[PDB]
Design a protein around this ligand. Structure first.
Ligand SMILES: [Cl-]
Ligand SMILES: [Cl-]
Ligand SMILES: [K+]
Ligand code: NA
Length: 162
């Protein structure tokens, strides 16, 4: 298991524009297009992202390309963030994937606001961190996914994805 396989499980793969769990137009493997309620705006974002007139439809290779870019952007985001980078650097390879997963889903700024959870993770207080992480809108809105990510943080294993 690796970050690509992990996020592929959590995000799915859909080749037509669809609405994510927040009601936002998305495509591929969790590629957020826009928060605009306009499908035309989402179609314009898609064509810009792919570099052709897609009419709301892409290929798997195109989906995978956006996914590679988006995973990299999540990791870049962490490394450039003053609150996330020290936690990331303190973690093992498996728990780093849990943090990347959270940033992929909710963005750099949003995960950086989990100040108390991040401190617990830095302190390697894994059970305490797991408890704190669940006291969140994130957990309540996407509980099965949050439970998987939280188990990854608690254990440093892939048991929730195996
Ligand atoms: Cl709560
Ligand atoms: Cl869920
Ligand atoms: K297609
Ligand atoms: Na999704």
């Amino acid at each position: 298991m690796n970050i690509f396989e992990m996020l592929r499980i959590d995000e799915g793969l859909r080749l037509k524009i669809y609405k994510d769990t927040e009601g936002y137009y998305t495509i591929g493997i969790g590629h957020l297009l826009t928060k605009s309620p306009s499908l035309n705006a989402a179609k314009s974002e898609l064509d810009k992202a792919i570099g052709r007139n897609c009419n709301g439809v892409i290929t798997k290779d195109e989906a995978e390309k956006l996914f590679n870019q988006d995973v990299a952007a999540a990791v870049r985001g962490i490394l450039r963030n003053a609150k996330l980078k020290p936690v990331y650097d303190s973690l093992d390879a498996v728990r780093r994937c849990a943090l990347i997963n959270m940033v992929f889903q909710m963005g750099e700024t949003g995960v950086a606001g989990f100040t108390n959870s991040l401190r617990m993770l830095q302190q390697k207080r894994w059970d305490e961190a797991a408890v704190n992480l669940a006291k969140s809108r994130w957990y309540n809105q996407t509980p099965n996914r949050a439970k998987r990510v939280i188990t990854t943080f608690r254990t440093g294993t892939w048991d929730a994805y195996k």
